[PDB]
Design an enzyme around this catalytic site. Structure first.
Site, PDB file in Angstrom:
ATOM      1  N   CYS B  28      10.389  25.788 -41.217  1.00 24.34           N
ATOM      2  CA  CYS B  28      10.497  25.482 -39.785  1.00 24.34           C
ATOM      3  C   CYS B  28      10.432  23.983 -39.510  1.00 24.34           C
ATOM      4  CB  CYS B  28       9.435  26.231 -38.971  1.00 24.34           C
ATOM      5  SG  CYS B  28       7.713  25.912 -39.441  1.00 24.34           S
ATOM      6  N   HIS B  89       3.905  26.887 -36.942  1.00 25.02           N
ATOM      7  CA  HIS B  89       5.315  27.125 -36.665  1.00 25.02           C
ATOM      8  C   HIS B  89       5.784  26.312 -35.458  1.00 25.02           C
ATOM      9  CE1 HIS B  89       9.001  29.664 -37.063  1.00 25.02           C
ATOM     10  NE2 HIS B  89       9.080  29.485 -35.757  1.00 25.02           N
TER      11      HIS B  89
END
Lengths: 148, 146
Positions: B28, B89
């Protein structure tokens, strides 16, 4: 019988937007609330329906997820349902009682590629692809704590 | 379109690898870093958690996913992020219809698998779970990308 077998999750005809699958022991079902995807790979919204075929009774798993459609597994004796759930970059493997729907065991797998087969659980790190077998490090973890 | 520049940045950054040997689609932070690179937007350094600390300090915090989609629709770069115990994330918020009238559409790579990945067809609400999607933070850069 602490073996886990993947349970394919497929559209149920007659039950609009339901996906599920079953074996002689347990039925498992999700509702698909994604507006734009009739072929979703995961299920963010609970509940998850668990039908114990022995007892005729069923129960609901009211919170959790996101559940992976490819990630549901049934124990040989039908007493446990093992599921892959993820949020963001994190992920875990959770084992539920098929009769009560209570969490029996939970294991954080974040960062690791993974697989479940007859032999047990495998987790791996340093990988080329989503295949655990592309991993330069592979640990075999026991599924015993998920069973009993 | 006004947010088009960012959509393109995302599309391109999809197949790159910001960190060598690790595909962006599987990382990510890498995918975000690539997007920030293409758009020439300063971005904090390190893994997801670190990037969230960076944005927390040096970026403007928006009030809601909806407001975040407003900024993102104006051609601003908007990052949704949340820290984990280890793997955090982050995702690029893009303009479009909110999911459950709440969660905005995003682009993100994820080490969790294809399921955690979004090519713009999932919102933060389909990437983060039922509890995390309500804890998200949204950061915007003070200057538009278009």
């Amino acid at each position: 019988d602490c073996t886990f077998t993947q349970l394919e999750i497929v559209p149920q005809f007659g039950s609009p937007n339901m996906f599920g699958g079953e074996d002689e022991h347990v039925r498992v079902m999700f509702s698909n609330e994604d507006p734009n995807d009739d072929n979703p790979d995961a299920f963010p919204e609970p509940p998850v329906y668990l039908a114990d075929r022995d007892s005729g009774n069923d129960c609901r798993i009211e919170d959790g997820g996101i559940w992976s459609r490819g990630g549901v597994f049934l124990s040989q004796d039908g007493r446990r349902v093992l599921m892959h759930e993820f949020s963001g970059s994190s992920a875990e493997l959770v084992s539920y009682d098929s009769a009560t729907c209570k969490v029996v065991h939970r294991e954080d797998i974040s960062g690791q590629r993974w697989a479940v087969d007859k032999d047990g659980l495998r987790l791996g790190q340093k990988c080329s692809g989503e295949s655990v077998d592309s991993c330069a490090k592979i640990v075999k973890r026991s599924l015993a704590p998920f069973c009993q | 379109s006004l947010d088009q520049c960012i959509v393109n940045a995302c599309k391109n950054s999809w197949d790159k690898s910001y960190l060598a040997g690790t595909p962006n689609k599987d990382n990510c932070s890498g995918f975000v870093q690539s997007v920030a690179a293409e758009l020439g937007v300063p971005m904090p350094r390190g893994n997801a958690n670190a990037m969230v600390d960076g944005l927390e300090q040096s970026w403007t915090k928006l009030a809601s996913g909806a407001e975040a989609a407003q900024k993102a629709a104006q051609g601003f770069l908007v990052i949704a992020g949340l820290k984990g115990r280890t793997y955090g994330h982050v995702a690029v918020v893009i303009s479009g219809p909110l999911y459950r009238q709440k969660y905005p559409m995003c682009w993100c790579g994820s080490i969790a698998g294809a399921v955690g990945q979004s090519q713009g067809l999932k919102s933060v609400g389909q990437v983060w779970n039922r509890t995390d999607r309500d804890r998200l933070n949204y950061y915007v850069y003070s200057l538009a990308s278009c």
